[PDB]
Chains A and B, each alone.
With several copies, the nearest count.
Chain A
Amino acid sequence: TTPEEIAQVATISANGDKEIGNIISDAMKKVGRKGVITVKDGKTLNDELEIIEGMKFDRGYISPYFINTSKGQKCEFQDAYVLLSEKKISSIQSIVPALEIANAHRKPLVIIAEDVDGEALSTLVLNRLKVGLQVVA
């Protein structure tokens, strides 16, 4: 019934290590007692807990030129439009109207797709570099 019992169970099961029990109690407090907790290696001396919030997936951007924040080599937008598709965006005509809405409403656009072929990618990079369109594939 209490997180103290959770910490005690995780401490006993980890051969008396109180820090492992405390970190498991913190993880179960953050993501829930039925949440997803994954153990992996660390490059530091001490154990650490990282809480990943929202929808984070293992895919980076397609084009390196989309970086608008070079402080950490990342693309950063606030209040952005999202265009989602399971088909690879290749043609010009399949990418112009979404850019038209994103330019008319003056909002960033994140295009999550299976892939982006050379024609649509060249259009996106040319609009990002030349006129300064806030887009990321």
Chain B
Amino acid sequence: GQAFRKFLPLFDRVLVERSAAETVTKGGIMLPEKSQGKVLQATVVAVGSGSKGKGGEIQPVSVKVGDKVLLPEYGGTKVVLDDKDYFLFRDGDILGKYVD
């Protein structure tokens, strides 16, 4: 597992930072902050050790630290680290990651 700001999630939980919500369109129209909702794009800042779905060995998490991922609408837990918001999800709850 990888720790982020003295916090290490347990089992297959993944701690992510949501991306900054957009406020200005490509043409230059300012957007209201209340009508932005929650950003479904995040970056993985902490990973756990993994689950025990098969006996014996320990399964690594599919995502790693520094991977941009797409979050579902629900299923996250709010964690306040250094008065900053981060979201805890499960390894299987992540939809897919952006490769480059």
Contact = CB atoms under 8 A, between A and B. Distances in A.
Interface of A: 92, 96, 99-100, 103-104, 119, 122-123, 126-127, 130-131, 133
Interface residues of B, number: 9
B32 A123 contact: yes
B27 A127 contact: no
B60 to A, nearest CB: 39
B34 A103 contact: no
B29 A99 contact: yes
Residue with the greatest number of chain A CB neighbours at <10 A, chosen from B25, B31, B32, B35: B32
Interface in B22-39: 25, 27-32, 34-35
B27 A104 contact: yes
A99 B34 CA distance: 19
A55 B71 CA distance: 51
Contacts, number: 31
Interface of B: 25, 27-32, 34-35
User: Taking chain B's interface residues, is the majority helix, strand, or loop, or is none over half, making it mixed?
Assistant: loop
| A-side interface mostly | helix
A100 B25 CA distance: 9
A92 B35 contact: yes
A94 to B, nearest CB: 12
Contact of A126 (B25, B28, B30): B30
A126 B32 contact: yes
A23 to B, nearest CB: 50
Contacts of B27: 99-100, 103-104
A103 B27 CA distance: 8
Contacts of A103: 27-29
A121 to B, nearest CB: 10
